Design a protein around this ligand. Structure first.
Ligand code: SF4
Length: 361
DNA sequence: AGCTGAGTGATCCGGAGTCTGAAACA
DNA sequence: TTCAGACTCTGGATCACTCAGCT
């Protein structure tokens, strides 16, 4: 059949795209997180039409404002209190993200429906049910579309789905697979049958890589096509033609700091001027929605208390600071970005340990 | 035939950055 | 040197309305 042999052609190219970038884009496979299903639902709720860092910071502020009493799937937010809470404070809590009243009312309605139907607030059983019925039940909610449900299923329930976002569509069109021409998002009906038969781990990995490639090299305006490894196979090419010292685990400075997560590859950093940068997984104790796909491989947080009041006592790694990932990554040299990926760190925001809430940098 | 209707295109609930061009001045 | 909007940002829900559909 012509279909199956045509499946091999792009699947061979897809793994070729993964293999070529994996040399430069670092190494990353499925690393589990302890986030509950409701947490992932609220995360996909908050990441609609907004940049990733703002969406994550909004969820962090939401968690800090209404905390579960603490020091596996466990909710980090007293969702019952939020549902019982008045709309004004909830809207004020996430006002920094935007659409504060709209999203707050949608969240309150979601929680109210969850309480009214199927008893109390729990969605752990969604993992057991067959994927199609879970997808339909998730889509049944208002404020959720196809792409959000696909991302939830792929990242949380480990199904075989692929979110075709603006990053995915542009990359697929330009990179010899399928101008400023506005293309309607229907290439999924084209792309997915090609990718219907593929390894699950393959899909998750391909895309962590693509999200990264979309953000680093193949930006919408002025892509760094000179340093891009896939410039040879790029169809769009034919159309056109501060350093820090890292602190060991048992360093005396981290006595007040909490115990590091055993799974996190990152290590504690020293922000010299005295300030400390906490790794994202350690800062959040894992337990973050969407498998922690918000944060890069080497994304770290900052300590607001140590930033305002320095803890100063009077190997070397490079940290690139900026407002967002795409801004700093615009590099005319490939070697610099490869080094920053394999042996570098990135920080964009700040965080406080006392109230566990995000603070401006 | 004279009423569907399917399907798309604007719009906006909203903050927060960057980017142009205009202006201005030489 | 200002600076005011014009865009983008892992999208959804409403309302209005041009091309097919038909019988
Ligand atoms: S060569 Fe340029 S357009 Fe092609 S994939 Fe690389 S960055 Fe994108």
């Amino acid at each position: 059949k012509w279909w199956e042999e045509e499946r091999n052609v792009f699947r061979g190219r897809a793994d070729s795209f993964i293999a070529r970038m994996h040399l430069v884009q670092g190494d990353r496979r499925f690393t589990p997180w302890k986030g509950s299903v409701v947490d992932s639902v609220v995360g996909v709720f908050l990441t609609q039409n907004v940049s990733d860092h703002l969406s994550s910071s909004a969820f962090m502020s939401l968690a800090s404002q209404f905390p579960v009493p603490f020091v596996s799937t466990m909710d980090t937010v007293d969702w019952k209190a939020i549902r019982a809470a008045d709309v004004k404070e909830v809207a004020e809590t996430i006002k920094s993200r935007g659409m504060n009243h709209k999203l707050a009312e949608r969240i309150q309605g979601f929680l109210d429906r969850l309480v009214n139907d199927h008893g109390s607030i729990d969605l752990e059983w969604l993992r057991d049910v067959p994927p199609d019925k879970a997808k339909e039940y998730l889509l049944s909610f208002n404020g959720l579309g196809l792409k959000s449900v696909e991302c939830v299923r792929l990242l949380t329930l480990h199904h075989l789905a692929f979110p075709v976002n603006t990053n995915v569509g542009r990359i697929a069109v330009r990179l010899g697979w399928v101008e400023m021409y506005p293309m309607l998002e229907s290439i999924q009906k084209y792309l997915w049958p090609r990718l219907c038969k593929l390894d699950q781990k393959t899909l998750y990995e391909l895309h962590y890589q693509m999200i990264t490639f979309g953000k680093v090299f193949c930006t919408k305006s002025k892509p760094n096509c000179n340093a891009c490894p896939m410039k040879g196979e790029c169809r769009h090419f034919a159309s056109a033609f501060h350093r820090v010292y890292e602190l060991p685990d048992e360093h005396p400075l981290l006595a007040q700091l909490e115990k590091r997560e055993p799974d996190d590859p990152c290590s504690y950093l020293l922000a010299i001027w005295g300030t400390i940068l906490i790794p994202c997984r350690t800062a959040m104790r894992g337990s973050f929605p969407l498998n922690g796909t918000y944060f890069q491989v080497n994304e770290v947080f900052a300590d607001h208390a140590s930033s305002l009041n320095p803890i100063n006592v009077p190997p070397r790694r490079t940290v690139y600071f900026g407002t967002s990932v795409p801004t700093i990554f615009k590099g005319l040299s490939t070697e610099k970005i490869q080094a920053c990926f394999w042996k570098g760190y990135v920080c964009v925001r700040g965080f406080d340990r006392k109230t566990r809430g995000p603070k401006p940098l």
